[PDB]
Amino acid sequence: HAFFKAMLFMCSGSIIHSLNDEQDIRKMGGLYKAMPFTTTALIIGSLALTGMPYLTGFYSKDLIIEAVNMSYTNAWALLMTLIATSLTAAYSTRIIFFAFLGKPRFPPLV
Amino acid sequence: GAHLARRYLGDASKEPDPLRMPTFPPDYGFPERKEREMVATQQEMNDAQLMLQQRDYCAHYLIQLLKCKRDSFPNFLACKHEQHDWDYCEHLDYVKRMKEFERERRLLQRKKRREQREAEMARG
Amino acid sequence: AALQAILYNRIGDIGFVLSMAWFLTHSNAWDLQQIFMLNNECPNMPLIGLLLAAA
Amino acid sequence: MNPFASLTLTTLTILTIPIMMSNSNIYKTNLYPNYVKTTVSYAFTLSLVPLLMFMHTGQEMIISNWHWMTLQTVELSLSFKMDYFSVMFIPVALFVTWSIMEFSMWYMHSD
Amino acid sequence: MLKIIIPTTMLLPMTWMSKHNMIWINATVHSLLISLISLSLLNQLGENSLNFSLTFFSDSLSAPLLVLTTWLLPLMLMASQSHLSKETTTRKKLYITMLILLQLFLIMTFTATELILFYILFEATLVPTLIIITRWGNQTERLNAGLYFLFYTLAGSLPLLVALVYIQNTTGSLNFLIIHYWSHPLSNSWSNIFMWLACIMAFMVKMPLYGLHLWLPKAHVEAPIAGSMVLAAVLLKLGGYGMMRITTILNPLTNYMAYPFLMLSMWGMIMTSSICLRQTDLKSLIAYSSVSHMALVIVAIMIQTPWSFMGATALMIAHGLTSSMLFCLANTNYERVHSRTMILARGLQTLLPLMATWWLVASLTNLALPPSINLIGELFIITASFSWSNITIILMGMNMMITALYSLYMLITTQRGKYTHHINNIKPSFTRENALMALHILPLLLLTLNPKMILGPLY
Amino acid sequence: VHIEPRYRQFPQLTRSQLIQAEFFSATMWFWILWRFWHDSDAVLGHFPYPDPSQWTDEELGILPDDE
Amino acid sequence: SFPKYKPSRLATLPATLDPAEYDISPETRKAQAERLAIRSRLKREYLLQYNDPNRLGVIEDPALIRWTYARSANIYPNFRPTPKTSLLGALFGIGPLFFWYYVFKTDRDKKEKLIQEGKLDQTFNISY
Amino acid sequence: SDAPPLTLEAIKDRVLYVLKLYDKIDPEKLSVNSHFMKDLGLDSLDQVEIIMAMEDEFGFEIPDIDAEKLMCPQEIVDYIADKKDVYE
Amino acid sequence: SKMELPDYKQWKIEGTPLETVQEKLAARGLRDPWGRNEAWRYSGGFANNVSFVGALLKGFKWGFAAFVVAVGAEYYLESQ
Amino acid sequence: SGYTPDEKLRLQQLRELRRRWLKDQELSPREPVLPPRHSIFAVTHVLIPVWIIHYYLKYHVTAKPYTVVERKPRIFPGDTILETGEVIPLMKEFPDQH
Amino acid sequence: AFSAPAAYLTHQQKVLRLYKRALRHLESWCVHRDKYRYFACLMRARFDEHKNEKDMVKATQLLRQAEEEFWYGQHPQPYIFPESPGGTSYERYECYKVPEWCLDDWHPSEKAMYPDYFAKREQWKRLRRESWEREVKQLQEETPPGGPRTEALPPARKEGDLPPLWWHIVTRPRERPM
Ligand SMILES: CCCCCCCCCCCCCCCCCC(=O)OC[C@H](COP(=O)([O-])OCC(O)COP(=O)([O-])OC[C@@H](COC(=O)CCCCCCCCCCCCCCCCC)OC(=O)CCCCCCCCCCCCCCCCC)OC(=O)CCCCCCCCCCCCCCCCC
Ligand SMILES: CCCCCCCCCCCCCCCCC[C@@H](O)O[C@H](CO[C@H](O)CCCCCCCCCCCCCCC)COP(=O)(O)OCC[N+](C)(C)C
Ligand SMILES: CCCCCCCC/C=C\CCCCCCCC(=O)O[C@H](COC(=O)CCCCCCC/C=C/CCCCCCCC)COP(=O)(O)OCCN
Ligand SMILES: CCCCCCCCCCCC(=O)SCCNC(=O)CCNC(=O)[C@H](O)C(C)(C)COP(=O)(O)O
């Protein structure tokens, strides 16, 4: 997790510095083309965070889910872990959709 | 899972309890049972320093896999057959455990069926 | 925010200090090796202290 | 002597050299961040080797190099545990820190 | 022991025969030399103490306190000479004479073999402190503060005198060696209970114990900088040293006579730490923090374990150094702006960066950051209390949290934010002030390398 | 590499950043495909899951309820 | 119409939700003018000293001195022994002391009586 | 580095740009000193919208107490120049 | 250096969702006087943007081509 | 609506003064009047520190018992010991369910 | 920030401030520009529905109902400009602001560097010292006997006069002082 979480903060910081120290995603428009390398890095980090197979996050997160499923464990904890696994992809999709897709929403001076 | 739904919603008296199991003798329904054997000795596992939880009946394949990892260190992709053998032996052990679970469940169900049925035959 | 972080970390540090005191009082050591040897069946107090520190 | 202990302690030791030089002239110039980044990168590439030794033979060690104080039956010593956890976490942390300081050289340029 | 006492006495004619413009230089140089000489007492034998003669002896408990006093005198002189520049030569010499007399009484107090001599010197320390507070204090409340400081001490100390003469009559001696070797248990009786109280309450009020601590904020706030330095660093430790010396003959009664004092100390350390969170005066916060630390020391002494005494000794030394540094730091800003209110001057880090670094280090040592000796003593005391009872950890952790809270609150309020606009007389830090802070802080960090020097006889 | 603001127009792009981003995205996808070609068992599973209902009572050792 | 917002101690009432600022009378306007005049006079008095080239030092604020004096020195002269004051003082002073005495005494009595039984598992406890 | 320092000419040009992109104002008619209420026949809501558009343009908020009195483009230019310390 | 603003005449709301907003408002009797200020966000290089699934599949073509080349090499190499 | 004449006049006066001050904060071309090897890093920051530590560990730390403690290496069947020349026998002839 | 406040806000000022707050919070809710523009024109129409009301009581009641609606329907996380009192960069550069009087305490060796700057600073100090008395006299002249009524200050009215109380307004450190 160290690798891609550091990368995600790094991409967020590059985006913030490019858009005049702005951190609200509502004023972040279409950076998929304006910031290609940052977009690629953030997409790769989001896929690693969501447990895409054979990435960095796969080899640990999917094994963790497998072991949680096959253990004498609290049922509520298992259900909450699964719901958190849903929400992980949920906010990753939120970040990508609001920060990199659509039309620009930042001030005109690029 | 279906077993959890059967135990928690249906009659739990008809479902095995994982904590206290098996409750029946190991030679109850079998005429003769063969004792499970070991390939790796206590001293071999003590010298290999596997772990107290990895010293199961699959420990010999683990010893082979660890040795082959150690000899072929720079090529970390060369120990495929040993890993496959260890995984297969672990899968066989897990299947044996599932067989034990199903055997306990069926034995308990048959015992309950037969004892209430003999009680029903005796009450009339 | 810095003071908030300090406050929460000291809340956990309470449990850290509890774990240290229990381990010194019952195992006569602070080092990892002695603690493992002398605690075959670890009681709840040091583990709850460590859990509070981790939280 | 086994190089494992010496390399593991050197990886930690060389990180303190810029802290000692913080009072030197290099701290007053604009070359200090690059110097710190290079030091961290050298620490990472040095820590890579004990990781290889562990990945080969599973070498683990503890080093009680310095005795600090003894209270009755209890001895307090500067001791380092160099098991799998340490030898795996040190290179990852050094790698991440190297990348983040190289990033900081640009992000915090006007500070 | 005369090799320490005689130069300290020689400090008096030397400063009375000096030129009008050389008194500070001469006094500082020879005080530093005397501290260097006194540093040789740290070589301790282990088994028993160093018995120089019938009158004086040195212990592993006494030696760090003696070194701390001898080291504190030059720092007091360095801090004093700024605000005394307009004074006449005779009055400056009188002030230095007061400081030298206080040092002499302190060094003789910590080495006396017999309890009546200890009592005589321990009372004799009152007069120079009272004169300093009531003559060179700045405000009009210094008179009330001096009255409180004198009478709180004496009301506890007189019963100690009665108890000491009674004990010498009944036993035949008060020499500490004979007292220790011929110790007999105290029975469970009202007479023994009141003897215990008469032997304990004077040292209780000198710590001070919570509920008897009201004199300390007045005296420590209203005194000049040197007076506050000596009150916090050294004079508070007289009670702890007296307790460690006197509880040898109080067993087995202390087993239950200590319950109200332990309860008072724990709850009052919580109370004073909480009080520090709402304080408008910068010196009162430091005073109340001193009260909390001395409450922890009182608990350590009351529980009567080797780890407790070791932690108590370490905490006494560390608290003395840290409190002196904090008082000097507050005094610098007071000299700048002529007011003790904390929120008057803000954002001083923008104007004084090195003084801000000194503030940060002092605040970090006040909250007992590892591996400083402050946390060494505090952790040893906390472990001893946990052995005494596992429920003490709740109060210890609460006190730790509140201590970190008000320490960082003081640091943030004084150093961070934006500067006050109308205040425009904040000059750059002088060499004297920075040197004083460095001379406070460097021994603290150097003692970490050799913690056994301040852990005491039980080591 | 000197890039100037453009005021309501798409920012100026250099070839190096575009080719690097495309190369690394292609590298990620190629790695995923190569792994799935060589280690498909890690995702799809390797050993079959037995069905407990397919087990006879002779191999499981239970009597036919009459003894 | 819409659900109503109710204020409390730690979440006060917004100005736009205050009926007082929407029910205005000429005396309210006069009060606002008086408050503004007081503020303006204080601001002028402060700014005449703030911008003075001659002035060097800290400009003393009477209000801060009043606040500190009231919080520190004026409290005891205005104290009266009252049933409220007496009860609160007794509670907050001696209640916690007796509570902690009871807790610690009970715990230590249990521990000592359990020691006398020979059952505490004190193995390896050589440091105290 | 960061963005180049702002200049008076750029501020005035950008203000006139934003005002010429407004529909209720004639491009030819508009001038730097053109009053909003008097010359362009606008009301208070249009002035509020103009202030909000200026904030969106320059990426900073103008307090309502100060925005109330910006009734010509020159006043807006002066306010922006004085706030961001633009002197030439 | 010393750039200048483009012509303000080009910013037109036709062909953009601002035109749809304008016609839906005219269906109500209202008008939007701020569309030409917002038109630049749709006019130029920001005219077309990819979708989420297409953004996740950024370098799929090149990677797939390389993977096919590699597997064909494996097909043709182990025959020796 | 808008400023009063006094407000605007004072604002433009203050604007002129402030712009003059900001112009005056600007530096002349001479203002900072100052009064009057390839592998050096790798030999002083890596090689020297490891020389001291290796010497410190080899001759001082390892001169006392139980200071540097290594967990003993793992032994598997078929291994050969370096000291005694021992050979560990193989491990019981697997059933070989190939 | 720059203008002296009044004793109270008129109904018109409150109405405009509510309009601006509602527009900003609607923009926070409506992320996209076209949807925000559509709903902003709808808000403007609903706002102009009662533009020409003559009964002050019903106008006040409409204002109160609108404020209640805004409070119930406000965005819990409205967009804030970074330098605004709620922004992520509000007081970021306050630690870099050093008052100008600190330059007088500089060592002469420090002032050996930067000679022209300090000569011009001497010029500014002479200007302030030569204008202060006239500033005080003008403030005394133009003030009612019962003290000032507002926080407004008069401009300069003579030939070589400077507006009173100008030093600490003109000599602000900067917005990005370092
Ligand atoms: C080191 C840490 C810090 C330690 C130090 C800090 C804390 C300790 C020191 C400070 C706090 C202690 C203060 C002591 C009380 C001082 C009273 C005083 O100065 O009055 C002068 C002051 C001036 O006299 P004045 O101007 O001639 O009189 C005009 C009055 O103002 C006109 O007033 P009025 O006519 O409206 O009202 C007067 C009237 C009506 O008064 C009232 O309306 C209020 C009711 C007051 C009396 C009953 C209390 C009612 C509420 C609580 C009831 C008890 C609850 C259970 C307590 C235990 C719970 C386990 O008085 C009564 O009816 C009282 C009759 C007595 C019935 C109950 C007697 C109970 C004795 C104590 C029981 C609790 C023992 C402790 C248990 C601890 C367990 C761990 O008189 C008062 O204004 C106060 C009168 C009420 C006094 C009530 C005291 C209750 C507090 C507990 C006292 C026990 C502690 C002292 C031990 C020694 C006792 C012999
Ligand atoms: C603000 C801070 C000030 C400083 C605080 C100082 C604290 C001093 C308190 C002293 C601690 C306890 C004193 C004596 C120990 C026990 C006291 C007594 O209550 O215990 C019982 C004693 O029984 C009765 O309680 C007798 C005492 C009753 C009379 C005392 C009045 C207490 C009221 C509180 C007044 C406040 C005192 C402090 C004033 C400031 C035990 O029963 P018993 O085993 O049979 O007697 C043992 C003694 N023998 C062996 C000689 C027979
Ligand atoms: C500033 C605040 C500090 C207050 C501290 C005051 C408390 C001091 C402790 C009590 C003082 C008196 C102690 C007397 C000296 C002890 C000597 C002794 O032990 O003699 C006793 C004598 O014991 C007494 O006489 C004690 C009676 C008490 C006299 C004065 C009472 C005043 C109030 C006492 C309680 C308060 C003390 C603690 C309160 C602390 C502060 C609140 C027995 O002698 P014999 O007669 O020979 O008996 C054996 C042969 N039959
Ligand atoms: C996103 C969530 C936000 C939603 C919150 C709810 C928003 C409010 C909804 C409806 C608000 C109203 O109708 S509010 C009722 C409005 N009616 C009046 O104000 C009557 C008197 N008019 C005047 O005094 C002036 O003409 C004036 C109008 C000030 C213009 O002034 P200029 O011409 O001189 O600029």
- DSSP string across chain F: ------SSSPPP--HHHHHHHHHHHHHHHHHHHHHHHH-THHHH-SSPPPPGGG--HHHHT---S--
H-assigned helices in E55-141: 62-80, 89-109, 115-124, 126-136
> Are residues B64 and B82 in contact, defined by beta-carbon separation less than 8 angstroms?
yes
Q: Ligand 1 mean position to G94 CA, how many Å?
A: 13
Q: Ligand 1 mean position to G90 CA, how many Å?
A: 8
Give the C-alpha separation, E268 to E261, whole Å: 10
Element (H, E) at D80: strand D74-81
> Are residues J75 and J88 in contact, defined by beta-carbon separation less than 8 angstroms?
yes
Q: Ligand 1 mean position to G78 CA, how many Å?
A: 19
Q: What are the backbone angles phi and psi of residue A47, rounded to the nearest 5°?
A: -65, -35
* Tokens found for residue K29: 């809710």
Q: Answer whether D72 touches E (CB < 8 Å).
A: yes
* Atom from ligand 3 closest to the CA of residue E198: 9
Closest by alpha carbon to D44, among D101, D109, D111?
D101
Give the C-alpha separation, G100 to K15, whole Å: 60
Residue E281, strand partner residues: E341
Handedness of CA E371, E316, E339, K129 (dihedral sign): negative
Q: From the CA of I21, how many Å to the nearest CA of chain F?
A: 21
The binding-site residues of ligand 4, defined as CB within 6 angstroms of any ligand atom, are H 43-45; K 11-12, 15-16, 22, 25-26, 29, 46-47, 50-51, 53, 59, 62-63, 66, 69-70, 73-74
Among G79, G80, G86, which residue has the most ligand 1 atoms within 8 Å of its CB, making it the best to mutate?
Answer: G86
Give the C-alpha separation, A55 to H31, whole Å: 60
B contact test, residue of D51, D53, D54, D56 with most B CBs within 10 A? D56
User: SS3 for E56?
Assistant: strand
Residue K102 CA: distances (Å) to CA of B90, D51, K124, K171: 77, 54, 15, 13
> Are residues E218 and E158 in contact, defined by beta-carbon separation less than 8 angstroms?
no
> Are residues H40 and H32 in contact, defined by beta-carbon separation less than 8 angstroms?
no
Structure solved via: cryo-EM
In F, minimum Cα distance to I69 occurs at: F30
Element (H, E) at J70: strand J68-70
Strand order across the J68-70 sheet? D74-81, D61-71, J68-70
Give the C-alpha separation, E356 to E349, whole Å: 5
Residue K40 CA: distances (Å) to CA of B53, E366, K37: 67, 57, 5
> Cβ contacts of residue B114 below 8 Å, gap of 6+?
F65
The binding-site residues of ligand 2, defined as CB within 6 angstroms of any ligand atom, are E 188-190, 193, 211-212, 260
Instruction: Return the exposure string of E359-398: e unless at least 16 CB atoms fall within 10 Å of the residue's CB, then b.
Output: bebbbbbbbbeeebbbbbbbbbbbbbbbbbbbebbebbbb
> Are residues K2 and H81 in contact, defined by beta-carbon separation less than 8 angstroms?
no
Angle, in degrees to the nearest 10, between helices E62-80 and E237-246: 170
K47 and H45: CB-CB below 8 Å?
Answer: yes
Residue D75, strand partner residues: D70
Phi-psi region for residue C28, left (φ > 0), alpha (ψ -120 to 50) or beta? left
From D62, D73, D76, residue closest to C28, measured CB to CB = D73
* Tokens found for residue J90: 């193989």
Residue D76, strand partner residues: D69
Q: Ligand 2 mean position to E148 CA, how many Å?
A: 27
Residue E112, strand partner residues: E56
From G3, G22, G40, residue closest to K148, measured CB to CB = G40
* Tokens found for residue A3: 């690798």
Q: What are the backbone angles phi and psi of residue E87, rounded to the nearest 5°?
A: -75, 160
Residue K164 CA: distances (Å) to CA of J20, K120, K171: 17, 21, 14
Question: How many D×G Cβ pairs under 8 Å?
Answer: 6
Q: Answer whether G57 touches E (CB < 8 Å).
A: yes
> Are residues B65 and B79 in contact, defined by beta-carbon separation less than 8 angstroms?
yes
Burial (Cβ within 10 Å: 0-12, 13-18, ≥19) of residue E417: middle
Q: Answer whether A16 touches K (CB < 8 Å).
A: no
Phi-psi region for residue D67, left (φ > 0), alpha (ψ -120 to 50) or beta? beta
Amino acid at K140: Q
Give the C-alpha separation, I35 to I19, whole Å: 8
> Are residues K166 and J17 in contact, defined by beta-carbon separation less than 8 angstroms?
yes
Give the C-alpha separation, K1 to H83, whole Å: 10
Give the C-alpha separation, E59 to E110, whole Å: 9
> Are residues E41 and E66 in contact, defined by beta-carbon separation less than 8 angstroms?
yes
Phi-psi region for residue G121, left (φ > 0), alpha (ψ -120 to 50) or beta? left
CA angle G82, G84, G89 (to 5 degrees): 90
Q: What are the backbone angles phi and psi of residue E81, rounded to the nearest 5°?
A: -70, -10
* Atom from ligand 4 closest to the CA of residue K43: 9
Largest CA distance in chain J: 107
* Tokens found for residue B89: 């032996």
* Tokens found for residue K112: 């050996």
Give the C-alpha separation, D11 to D13, whole Å: 6
Task: Please count the other Cβ atoms lying within 10 Å of the Cβ belonging to residue A36.
Answer: 20
DSSP A50-69: TT-TTSTTIIIIIHHHHHHH
Burial (Cβ within 10 Å: 0-12, 13-18, ≥19) of residue E120: middle
Instruction: Classify strands D74-81 and D61-71 as parallel, antiparallel or unpaired.
Output: antiparallel
Question: Is H13 considered catalytic here?
Answer: no
In B, minimum Cα distance to D59 occurs at: B70
Closest by alpha carbon to B38, among J77, J94, J89?
J94
Q: Ligand 2 mean position to E154 CA, how many Å?
A: 23
Give the C-alpha separation, D55 to D87, whole Å: 10
Q: Ligand 1 mean position to G83 CA, how many Å?
A: 6
| Residue E358 DSSP one-character state | H
* Tokens found for residue A51: 């447990």
Closest by alpha carbon to E249, among E309, E146, E178, E316?
E178
Do D and I touch (≥3 CB pairs < 8 Å)? Answer: no
DSSP I18-34: HHHHHHHHHTTT---TT
> Are residues H31 and H75 in contact, defined by beta-carbon separation less than 8 angstroms?
no
What are the structural domains, with CATH classification, of chain H?
A: 8-84 (1.10.1200.10)
Handedness of CA E198, E203, E206, E210 (dihedral sign): negative
Amino acid at F31: W
Q: Which residue has the tokens 């949807």?
A: K35
Angle, in degrees to the nearest 10, between helices C2-27 and C44-54: 160
User: SS3 for J83?
Assistant: coil
Instruction: Return the exposure string of E145-166: e unless at least 16 CB atoms fall within 10 Å of the residue's CB, then b.
Output: bbebbbebbeebbebbbebbee
* Tokens found for residue G72: 């520190």
Give the C-alpha separation, E325 to E441, whole Å: 7
> Are residues B102 and F52 in contact, defined by beta-carbon separation less than 8 angstroms?
yes
H contact test, residue of A17, A105, A109 with most H CBs within 10 A? A109
Residue A103 CA: distances (Å) to CA of E305, H67, I51, I56, K30: 73, 29, 12, 18, 14
Q: Which chains touch F (3 or more CB pairs under 8 A)?
A: A, B, I
Q: Answer whether K42 touches I (CB < 8 Å).
A: yes
CA D80 from centroid of its chain's CA atoms: 12
User: SS3 for K62?
Assistant: helix
Q: What share of chain A is helix, strand, coil (3-state, %, to 5)?
A: 65, 0, 35
In H, minimum Cα distance to A110 occurs at: H3
| Residue E416 DSSP one-character state | S
Counting ligands in written order, which one lies closest to the CA of residue E260?
Answer: 2
Amino acid at I35: G
Largest CA distance in chain C: 41
* Tokens found for residue J66: 């139980």
Q: Answer whether E263 touches G (CB < 8 Å).
A: yes
Task: Please count the other Cβ atoms lying within 10 Å of the Cβ belonging to residue J8.
Answer: 15
Give the C-alpha separation, A6 to D94, whole Å: 12
* Tokens found for residue K133: 């008395």
> Cβ contacts of residue E86 below 8 Å, gap of 6+?
none
CA angle D2, D8, D12 (to 5 degrees): 150
Counting ligands in written order, which one lies closest to the CA of residue E209?
Answer: 2
Counting ligands in written order, which one lies closest to the CA of residue E151?
Answer: 3
Task: Please count the other Cβ atoms lying within 10 Å of the Cβ belonging to residue E39.
Answer: 14
User: SS3 for C39?
Assistant: coil
> Are residues F11 and A35 in contact, defined by beta-carbon separation less than 8 angstroms?
no
* Tokens found for residue H62: 């103008």
> Are residues E377 and E313 in contact, defined by beta-carbon separation less than 8 angstroms?
yes
User: SS3 for B122?
Assistant: helix
Residue A72 CA: distances (Å) to CA of A75, A77, D79, F51: 9, 11, 38, 21
Q: How many CA within 13 A on the CB side of residue E127?
A: 10
| Residue D103 DSSP one-character state | H
H-assigned helices in E304-430: 306-337, 348-351, 353-366, 373-388, 392-415
Q: Indicate if ligand 3 lies below 6 Å from the C-beta of E163.
A: yes
Give the C-alpha separation, G53 to G60, whole Å: 17
Handedness of CA E172, E177, E182, E184 (dihedral sign): positive
Q: What are the backbone angles phi and psi of residue D62, rounded to the nearest 5°?
A: -130, 140
Q: From the CA of D68, how many Å to the nearest CA of chain E?
A: 8
Q: How many CA within 13 A on the CB side of residue K152?
A: 19
From H44, H69, H84, residue closest to K175, measured CB to CB = H84
Question: How many C×D Cβ pairs under 8 Å?
Answer: 9
Q: Ligand 4 mean position to K47 CA, how many Å?
A: 5
> Are residues A4 and A45 in contact, defined by beta-carbon separation less than 8 angstroms?
yes
- Output the residue whose Cα is nearest ligand 2's atom 48: E189
* Tokens found for residue E453: 């020097």
Residues of H in contact with K16 (CB under 8 A): 44-45, 48, 64, 68
F24 and I67: CB-CB below 8 Å?
Answer: no
Residue D78, strand partner residues: D66
Intra-chain end-to-end CA distance of chain H, in Å: 21
Phi-psi region for residue H61, left (φ > 0), alpha (ψ -120 to 50) or beta? beta
Do I and F touch (≥3 CB pairs < 8 Å)? Answer: yes
User: SS3 for E459?
Assistant: coil
Q: What are the backbone angles phi and psi of residue E66, rounded to the nearest 5°?
A: -65, -45
- Output the residue whose Cα is nearest ligand 3's atom 37: E197
Among E190, E203, E253, which residue has the most ligand 2 atoms within 8 Å of its CB, making it the best to mutate?
Answer: E190
Catalytic-labelled residue, pool H43, H56, H66, H82: H43
Task: Please count the other Cβ atoms lying within 10 Å of the Cβ belonging to residue K85.
Answer: 10
Give the C-alpha separation, E438 to E34, whole Å: 20
| Residue E81 DSSP one-character state | T
In G, minimum Cα distance to E281 occurs at: G68
Task: Please count the other Cβ atoms lying within 10 Å of the Cβ belonging to residue C22.
Answer: 23
Q: After which residues is chain F broken (C to N over 2.5 A)?
A: none
Closest by alpha carbon to K71, among E13, B87, E138, G17?
G17
